[PDB]
């Protein structure tokens, strides 16, 4: 798995992998995904 599960801001890399990206909407969470590229 590279970029999934939950994604935090406050964390940096948010996931561990730049080409992804954290999706932050639970009002206090966040989830973390690696889309292609």
Do not use: K, Q, Y
Request: with cysteine.
């Amino acid at each position: 798995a590279d970029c999934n599960g939950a994604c935090s801001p406050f964390e940096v890399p948010p996931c561990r992998s730049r080409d992804c990206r954290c999706v932050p909407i639970g009002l206090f969470v966040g989830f973390c995904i690696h889309p292609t590229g």
